[PDB]
Amino acid sequence: MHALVQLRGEVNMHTDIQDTLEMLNIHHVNHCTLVPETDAYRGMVAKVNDFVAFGEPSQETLETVLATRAEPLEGDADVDDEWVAEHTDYDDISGLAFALLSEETTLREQGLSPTLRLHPPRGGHDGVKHPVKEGGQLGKHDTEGIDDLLEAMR
Amino acid sequence: FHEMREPRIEKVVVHMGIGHANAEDILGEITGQMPVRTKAKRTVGEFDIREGDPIGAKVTLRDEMAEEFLQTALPLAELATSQFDDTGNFSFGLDVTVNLVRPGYRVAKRDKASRSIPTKHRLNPADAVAFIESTYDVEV
Amino acid sequence: ATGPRYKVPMRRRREARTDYHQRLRLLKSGKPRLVARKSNKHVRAQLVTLGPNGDDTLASAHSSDLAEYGWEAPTGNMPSAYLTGLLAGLRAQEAGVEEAVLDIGLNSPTPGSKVFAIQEGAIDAGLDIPHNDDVLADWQRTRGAHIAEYDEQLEEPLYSGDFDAADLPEHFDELRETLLDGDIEL
Amino acid sequence: KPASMYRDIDKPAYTRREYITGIPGSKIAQHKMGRKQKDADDYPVQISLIVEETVQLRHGSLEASRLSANRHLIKELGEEGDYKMTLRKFPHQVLRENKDGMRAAFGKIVGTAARVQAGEQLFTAYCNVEDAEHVKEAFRRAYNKITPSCRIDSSPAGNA
Amino acid sequence: PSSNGPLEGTRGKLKNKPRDRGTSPPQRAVEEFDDGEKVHLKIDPSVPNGRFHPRFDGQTGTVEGKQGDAYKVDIVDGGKEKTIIVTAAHLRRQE
RNA sequence: CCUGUCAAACUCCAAACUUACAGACGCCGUUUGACGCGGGGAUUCCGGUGCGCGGGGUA
RNA sequence: AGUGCAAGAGCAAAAGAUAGCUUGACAGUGUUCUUCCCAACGAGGAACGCUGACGCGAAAGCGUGGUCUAGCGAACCAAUU
RNA sequence: UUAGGCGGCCACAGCGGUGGGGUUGCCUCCCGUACCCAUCCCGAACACGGAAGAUAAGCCCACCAGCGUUCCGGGGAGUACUGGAGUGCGCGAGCCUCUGGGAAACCCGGUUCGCCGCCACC
Ligand SMILES: [Cl-]
Ligand SMILES: [Cl-]
Ligand SMILES: [Mg+2]
Ligand SMILES: [Mg+2]
Ligand SMILES: [Mg+2]
Ligand SMILES: [Mg+2]
Ligand SMILES: [Mg+2]
Ligand SMILES: [Mg+2]
Ligand SMILES: [Mg+2]
Ligand code: NA
Ligand code: NA
Ligand code: NA
Ligand code: NA
Ligand SMILES: [Sr+2]
Ligand SMILES: [Sr+2]
Ligand SMILES: [Sr+2]
Ligand SMILES: [Sr+2]
Ligand SMILES: [Sr+2]
Ligand SMILES: [Sr+2]
Ligand SMILES: [Sr+2]
The missing domain is CATH 1.10.15.30 (Ribosomal protein L30/L7, central domain)
Known part of the structure; x- marks a missing residue:
């Protein structure tokens, strides 16, 4: 089970990518959803990979x-x-x-x-122009990294 | 093993390649059976622009007709090793072609389940010269 | 054989056993095929139907099992062929088959031949098969008359293992008589 | 005409002679030089000139560089020196020029060029450990007459 | 395209892989399908007749009856429903 | 045999990917009636920019 | 290779060759697709049917012109059946 | 299937090669033209009639990998290419990073000298 948080707005994001977020019950920035780890859901998160932050908390x-x-x-x-x-x-x-x-x-x-309407990250996040491995906040996170973000957005 | 391997005569084809016929009458005499016309293909400068039309004749003899012919025909030639095919065939001269082969040749001439004859059962020039020479005449 | 792009014919084509173009035209009827074959010594009739993994034979008859009803004569002639067709036909009716199409495979449609005799026999057995009477040999030939007269020009019995001297078409009658009858174990 | 006009790979591959006519002849006189009767394996040293960027080299440029390189090898090793150099690329790409404004602009055929990917060996020489520096000089003069920067890479040669 | 006939741009889809070259097996040309069956449409290069418009190659329709020996297959071109007359030689059961 | 190169109008191979149908999960619809159908009214048929893939052209 | 003519495609006990026979290059009326992807639009075209009458074949079957994609023309008027 | 017939898939089945197999059995080669039928000329073939001979062909059985083919291991190669993302780099053509996919040639070692269905049959 992975926690999904939208960190990048809808303006200019591909429509099929935006519809995917909506199917995952996320309609706003900072909104979080809990998704089971299945093959079907796996394809979905991999698709929204660049506009979200996810991991197991x-x-x-x-x-x-x-x-x-x-x-x-x-x-x-x-x-x-x-x-x-x-x-x-x-x-x-x-x-x-x-x-x-x-x-x-x-x-x-x-x-x-289905949604946890979180608060902006206290102290800010690592940025939405780079993935985690490059110091950004996008993509898959460690349970510790994911917890750091979710706790900052508590 | 040897009985079904010893050569024989499939056919003796006698033909006169003229090029425009009146020569059927002699073949009908020298062989004993009716000959057939020979048509050509492709246009030819040598005033031979007519594709389908008499240009030759031939007579294919088998069994007795074939041998009764060669008896009085072979003596008229001077066979040589070169005059032999790679399949064990030889022709001399008015052309005279002798097609030799082993017993079950039919396997390649029949309609159903026909098959090509294995090279092992294919006649050889050596086997050919022998068989023939082994009957009324010389070699080289 | 030569390389990647080389085209090898379908197995039954290279074995020279199946004429696929004729096959297709045959299968288009939607009916079972009366497959008529023949060897130097024998003749075989089979009622074949189309199936998922290959054809399906519902009934059939061989010239060999003809003796099983009283036949001591050769099995590669006209009387032989007809009776075989009739035997196969009768068994056809048994399994519920009511119609067919003659499949002479790679044999020639010569008038009065055996594949046509097999057909007339299978038709008399009650099977509905598209045919043409003036292509079937005349009754007498089917019986074996042509071979009787041939033996007539005697000097040396036609048959080796004395089945009889002046041969017998009348026997053909006895056997056909035995098949058309009800009883008989098909 | 400036090479800036054709040095980049900004057009489809245009090489089909069956649909292109009037293609000018190449200016490249030889692709195999030195003692072309001897094998390449018969040498202790093998040095190639490697292109550092992907580009198109017109035949007039291949000829100038090759010429200005073999010329040096000839001047330093003689008209029969024990060496051999190979220009391994051929100008297959046909070039046009629109020489009336932009109307019916498809250009007329004006030349040919060879497409070279970065990292590839344009030239390759085979020499004896003695003339190893004369070939490095021939290449120095060669890469000065072609568009991209080049690496003079020394393949078989651990005699330094 | 430069022209607009039925076979425009069909060089690939109507060409046989060299080994499938030559008269095709009669089995699939005599196959029988039931109404309601899902069938994939694909023209067999070696079979001249009984074809549909090349543009429909790759469709998976539904047999809804037949006309003579040919079959009437229902498909949905984009959002438009169409009926295709096609012979078994160019059809294949789905799954 | 060996050795040096290519293809928009080549292909023994061959993706990513696009696409038909179906099942599954998701989302949605059955008082917010979706999907589909019939009818009234249009405006519109000079477009532009970024990015990806292009074709022409030195640009 | 050949298969009338562009190109691409199809074809080998054939869709090519030869021989023989024959006039289905037939009449009536449709289904569907195409023309016009999606998505409405005519002429024209194609595939597939039913009915009638025939040709060839032992028969299955093939023949709604030439292996497939070009070779086409509204209303008014005239002539014609 | 101790040799047969009709096939499905249509080279994993092709090409080539070795060894084995048949007294009233099977398939053949084989023997023979009075008939049905046949050859633009030939009982060659087609067709019919038949058993003196034979297992040399074919065929079936067992097998071999040199060529061709199928699949697989290891290497090439997570390379080439690529869907999504970037205030990453480059004068620029272009490149890189993260995420999701992922070849081809070729080499070496295996596999492959058909598999399967129906009927008939010491
Ligand atoms: Cl047979
Ligand atoms: Cl259609
Ligand atoms: Mg609420
Ligand atoms: Mg920042
Ligand atoms: Mg293409
Ligand atoms: Mg007017
Ligand atoms: Mg008029
Ligand atoms: Mg042997
Ligand atoms: Mg910049
Ligand atoms: Na003549
Ligand atoms: Na085919
Ligand atoms: Na119309
Ligand atoms: Na044998
Ligand atoms: Sr350009
Ligand atoms: Sr330079
Ligand atoms: Sr596309
Ligand atoms: Sr046609
Ligand atoms: Sr004979
Ligand atoms: Sr610049
Ligand atoms: Sr993978």
């Missing part, structure tokens, strides 16, 4: 982001252990985080909006 990190940015499919009801426990097949955020990372369920499946 640590259980803790996913827990922090879920706590701070997860939302109900509808309404402004805050999402916390009590909410999770009273609306999902889990006891708390941790139970959810684990099930997501292990690809046993999805946010939509548990009555949550």
Whole structure:
């Protein structure tokens, strides 16, 4: 399960690449989605590779982001252990985080909006004109690199 | 093994390449059977621009007709090694061609499952000169 | 053989056993084929149908198993060929086959030949096969008459292993008589 | 006419003689020089002139460089010196010139050139360890008459 | 193109790989397909008749009946539905 | 045999990729009716730039 | 190689050659595609049918001109069946 | 299939080569032209009739790789080329990096001297 965050805007991006992001429920910059690691989804991320940042986050990190940015499919009801426990097949955020990372369920499946609307990266990111290996922020990241970004955007 | 390997006469073709015929009558006499006309192909400067039209005649003899002919025909020639083919054929002279081959030649002349004759079963000049020379005449 | 670009004919073409152009025209009928073959000593009839991995023979008859019903004569003649066709035809009706198209393979359509005799036999067996009567030898020849008279010009029995002296077309009748009959184990 | 006009590979390959007529003859007099009866393996030293950029070299340039190079080898080793040099490229590309404005502009045929990819050997010489420096000088004079920069690379030669 | 006949620009698609050169096997020319079957369309260079417009080479249509021995195959050219008359010699079952 | 070179109108080979059909996942539609169909009204048929691939031309 | 003529393509117990026979280069009426990719538009064209009448072949079958892609022309008027 | 017939795929099946196989069995070569039929001339072939001989052809069986072909290992080669991205480099033609794909020739070693279906048959 990889976390996907759009870091580059839609202006001038190929249309089929933009439609791919939308199919992955991402419609804005800084919006994050959780995608299972399958052959089908694999082709998709590889296609949006140059306008996003993705990788597998640590259980803790996913827990922090879920706590701070997860939302109900509808309404402004805050999402916390009590909410999770009273609306999902889990006891708390941790139970959810684990099930997501292990690809046993999805946010939509548990009555949550498929997207985590993150905040701009505190302290800024490494840039959207270069990949990770070249010092940029685009493309695949380490769990530590991905956690660094997601935590900065908490 | 030797019986089905010892040569024989497939056919004796006698033909007169004229070039415009009246010569059929002698072939009909010297061989004993009806001859056939010979047409040419391709236009020719030597006033031979007519593709299909009499230009020669021939008679193909087999079995007795062939041998009864060679008996009185071979003595009229002076066979030599060069006068022999690479397949074991020889022709002299009015041309006179003798086609020799082994028993199961039919395998290449039949319609169904025909097949080409293996070089091993193909007659040889050596085997040819022999067989023939081994019957009323000399070599080189 | 010569190189990469070299074109080798289909196997059955180089073996000189299948005339594909005639084959295709045959298959276009949509009907089973009455495949008539012949060897120096024998004659074979098969009802072949098209199949996924190759043709499919539904019924057939050989001149050999003709004896199985009372035949002590040679098996490479006209009477032989006809009866074989009839035998194959009868078995054809057994398996539910009702019509066919003559496939003489690489044999010649000579009038009164054996492949046409095999056809007349298969047709009398009740099979519906497109044909032409004035191409079939006359009844008597099928029976074996032509060979009887040949033996007539005797001096030395036509047949070696005395099957009979003045040969027999009347036997052909006995065998045909035995096949057209119901009983018979096809 | 300036080489700037044809030195780049900015056009389709144009070599089909069956559809092109009036192609001027080449100015290259020889492609194999020195003692062409002797093998190349019969020499201890093998030095080539390598092109550093992909380009097109017109036959008039191949001739000038080759000439100005073999000429030196002849002057330093004699009309029969124990050496041999090879110009391994032939001018297959046909060149045009639109010589009426841009209307029906397809040009008339004016010459030929050889396409050389960077890193390739244009010339190659074979000499004895003695004349190894005379050939390096012949190439120095050769690369001065062709468009790109060149490396004088010494293949078989560990006598330094 | 310089001309607009049916065989314009069909040099490749209507040429046989040298080894497939020569009269083709009768089996595929007599094959029977059922309505509803998915069939790929591809002209066989060696077969003259029963062809469709070369422009449709590569289509995977649906047999929806037949006309004589030929088959009527339904395809969707772009967004336009068309019916193609084609003989088995130029068809192949899908999958 | 050996040794030196090529092809827009060559090909024993041969991609990336484009493309037909289908299944799967995704997205979407069944009160926001999608897909498809019928009808009313148009405007439009001087385009331009970047990037990729070009063809002509010294440009 | 040949296959009437450009080019590209097709063809070998043939689509080429020869021989013989024959007039399907036939009448009626359609389906579909093309013309005009997608996407509406005529003439013209092609492939594939049904009906009628025939030719050749043992028969399957082949023949809606020449192996395939060029060789074409509205309304009004005239002549013709 | 101790030798047969009709095939599908249509060279992994081609080219070439070696060895083995047949008394009333099979396929053949083979023997022979009164007939049906046949040759622009030839019972050569086609067609018919037949068993004195034979396993030399063909054919079937076992096998060999020199040429041709198929697939595969290792090397060439993650090279050549390339879909997506870049305020990376270059005077420039052009190159590079990241991401996703990825040859061809050729060499060396293997594989390949058909596989499969239906019917018939000591
Ligand atoms: Cl047969
Ligand atoms: Cl069509
Ligand atoms: Mg909301
Ligand atoms: Mg920055
Ligand atoms: Mg092309
Ligand atoms: Mg007017
Ligand atoms: Mg008039
Ligand atoms: Mg032997
Ligand atoms: Mg710059
Ligand atoms: Na004549
Ligand atoms: Na073919
Ligand atoms: Na029309
Ligand atoms: Na044998
Ligand atoms: Sr240009
Ligand atoms: Sr220079
Ligand atoms: Sr394209
Ligand atoms: Sr036609
Ligand atoms: Sr004979
Ligand atoms: Sr400059
Ligand atoms: Sr790969």
